[PDB]
Structure 1
Amino acid sequence: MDLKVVVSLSSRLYTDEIAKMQQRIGCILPLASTHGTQNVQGLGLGQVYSLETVPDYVSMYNYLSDCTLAVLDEVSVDSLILTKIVPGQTYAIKNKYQPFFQWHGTGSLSVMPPVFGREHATVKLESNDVDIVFPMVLPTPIAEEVLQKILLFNVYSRVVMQAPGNADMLDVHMHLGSVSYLGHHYELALPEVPGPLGLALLDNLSLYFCIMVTLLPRASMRLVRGLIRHEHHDLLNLFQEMVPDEIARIDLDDLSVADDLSRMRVMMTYLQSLASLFNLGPRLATAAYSQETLTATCW
């Protein structure tokens, strides 16, 4: 019910880094194991993310969700005082990310690996030959958008192999490259080569997709095939007057409510399971916020 964790440093502070660490007060980082005394290298995210190593971000998500998360509380010349995240406790939080994102009230926050920039969220302590890597806390919308972009890139990279360069320039860096915000645009770091352990999510995705596409309903296809041709809609701006003929080929047979209903039941049941393969991030609920202090109360 009361948890205070001290991490001891063998070497000294080396004040060159302490100022940057001190304006870095009150922010999250995941620690290795829950004990009163910790090792210095297990403290940051520096273990999972080596400088020479190519980033595979689903592995970073897997490491990040497993480890306990801690609130930085105070840096001392030889000490790191951090209270941790008890699952049933409420505490304040204050954040400053160099990719700076503005929060709303009662908006759930997701914890993610620092996909944007290594120099940004990582502080090198070469005195111990270590590097403290802070994780990224974002509002849930932008979090799921960025994760989806990451997985779609991990697919289309395997796809765009041996295709015209017009595939190489466009899909690889038009939508999978940048993430927008209100009058703002942030680039992403992209894995030069497709990463293993990322598609391990995609295999399960393909499984669910096979099972779901075995049980798709019929009437919805008829409604859409009618509405694209007879009427105009903004959601139907995507489809032009021409229809993908796949829908025409599946559509051929008549309707029956008794068939649609059991398909709908099993489709609903297979839709509750996707939330496990889509979250991959510990979520924090907002209770109150002040832009004048940038200090919210997450939960």
Structure 2
Amino acid sequence: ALDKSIVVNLTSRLFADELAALQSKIGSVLPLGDCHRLQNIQALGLGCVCSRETSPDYIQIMQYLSKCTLAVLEEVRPDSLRLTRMDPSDNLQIKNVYAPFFQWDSNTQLAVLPPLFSRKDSTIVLESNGFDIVFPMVVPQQLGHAILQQLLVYHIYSKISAGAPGDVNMAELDLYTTNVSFMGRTYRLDVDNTDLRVLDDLSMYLCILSALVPRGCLRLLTALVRHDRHPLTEVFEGVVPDEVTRIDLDQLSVPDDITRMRVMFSYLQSLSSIFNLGPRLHVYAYSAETLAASCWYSPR
């Protein structure tokens, strides 16, 4: 009964060179800030948020991701793009045209991650209309929840060397992070020795957490005595380090500790939702000679 289609218009035509880059794909996954079918170009990319002159981000993308609506290409006419709307719990078809290449499989979990690599892999500049479209980085969830894993490690040790040289060895760091192991296969990626900046904001948080976090648990331990005190909490003294439990409340008075605890969990809830609420799907049928990934959209 229902009908769905999203037809994006343009002011002008395109160059014939760009059409070969947009017949590189004919079915892929676009985010889209609207739900309606006639729309100007300025929302289908990530150039609504991620642009060159802006400081590129991870979290302000990631907040925008789960709010956003997906849509899938069907045709590139020389004037207008035609899209197919991504309903909740709907089945439709993908071609896996993404860069850098990863191999898919049936019965994998798929998280839509934002791109963080070099520009020429992800984006396509539309030189006609001057606007940049950015494609999201479709990675499977087990890979997407591990491709960030070692890269986020790599950004932290880079800030160590640029202030203190004799602490991190580069051959150790290069060999263990940019070579991601999965499936039995390997994937060497782009290290960015061109000068990073997408993933400061997690390392901006996660260190400022990691000093506040063990200091925060001591006050939480000695403030719970009842006979409703949960029986598993007797055990977890053996887990917490011994140096953690040697801290007084001398240095931080009562008004200082409010600026800890009211702010402690405010990181974690801004942080726990951006590891979990990727707009996620599953793929149940796949063939490498056709490259037909097979979504069904779980709204999340």
**Shared fold, TM over 0.5:** yes
SS of the equivalent of 2:17 reads coil
> Are residues 248 and 201 of structure 1, via their aligned partners in 2, closer, same or farther at CA, if it must alter by over 3 Å?
closer
* Aligned counterparts, 1:54-133, within 5 A: 54-133=55-134
- 1:230 match: none
**Do structure 1's residue 30 and structure 2's residue 35 form an aligned pair?**
no
In structure 2, relative to structure 1, the CA distance for the partners of 1:105 and 1:203 (3 Å cut) is farther
Deviations 1:123-179 (A, max 9, x none): 111111122211111111111112233444455455556323442736764544443
How far the C-alpha of 1:8 sits from its partner, in A, is 0.3
Shift of 1:108: 0.8
Which of 273, 276, 279 is residue 273 of structure 2 equivalent to?
276
State how far apart, in whole Å, the 2-side matches of 1:39 and 1:247 are: 60
- Report the number of matched residues: 256
CA contact (8 A) 2:35 2:69 kept: yes
Partners of 1:76 and 1:42 in 2: CA distance? 19
The aligned counterpart of 1:290 is 287
- The reply on whether 1:135 has 2:136 as its aligned counterpart is yes
Q: Secondary structure at the match of 1:91?
A: strand
Q: Partners in 1 of 2:75 and 2:276 — Cα distance?
A: 31
Q: Name the structure 1 match of 2:200.
A: 195
Deviations 1:199-240 (A, max 9, x none): 457767877766678679676887x9xxxxxxxxxxxxxxxx
- Label 1:46 to 1:275 Cα distance change in 2 as closer, same or farther (>3 A): closer
Change in CA separation of 1:123 and 1:161 when aligned onto 2, cut-off 3 Å:
closer
Q: Which amino acid counterpart does residue 31 of structure 2 have in structure 1?
A: P
Aligned equivalent of 2:47 = 46
Measure the CA separation in 2 of the matches of 1:277 and 1:41. 25
Aligned mates of 1:100, 1:14 — CA distance in 2? 26
Q: CA deviation at 1:48?
A: 2.1
CA distance in 1, matches of 2:282, 2:206: 26
Contact 1:180 1:186 in 2 (8 A): no
Letter aligned with residue 123 of structure 2: T
The 10-residue stretch of structure 1 (11-20 or 54-63) with the greater mean CA deviation from structure 2: 54-63
Q: 1:186 aligns with which of 171, 189, 203?
A: 189
Cα deviation for residue 102 of structure 1 reads 1.0
Deviates more, 1:282-291 or 1:40-49: 40-49
Distance 1:84 1:198, change over 3 A: farther
Q: CA RMSD in A?
A: 3.5
**1:236 aligned partner:** none
Structure 2 CA distance for partners of 1:21 and 1:194, relative to 1, 3 Å: closer
2: CA distance, partners of 1:249 / 1:22: 58
C-alpha change, 1:197 and 1:56, in structure 2 (3 Å) is same
Give me the TM-score of the superposition, normalised by structure 2.
0.70
What is the DSSP-based 3-state SS (H/G/I as helix, E as strand, rest coil) of the residue aligned with 1:187? coil
Q: Give the Cα separation in 2 of the matches to 1:150 and 1:178.
A: 10
Gaps of at least 5 residues in structure 1 are 225-244, 251-272
TM-score, with normalisation over the residues of structure 1?
0.71
Q: Is the 8 Å Cα contact of residues 124 and 130 (structure 1) preserved in structure 2?
A: yes
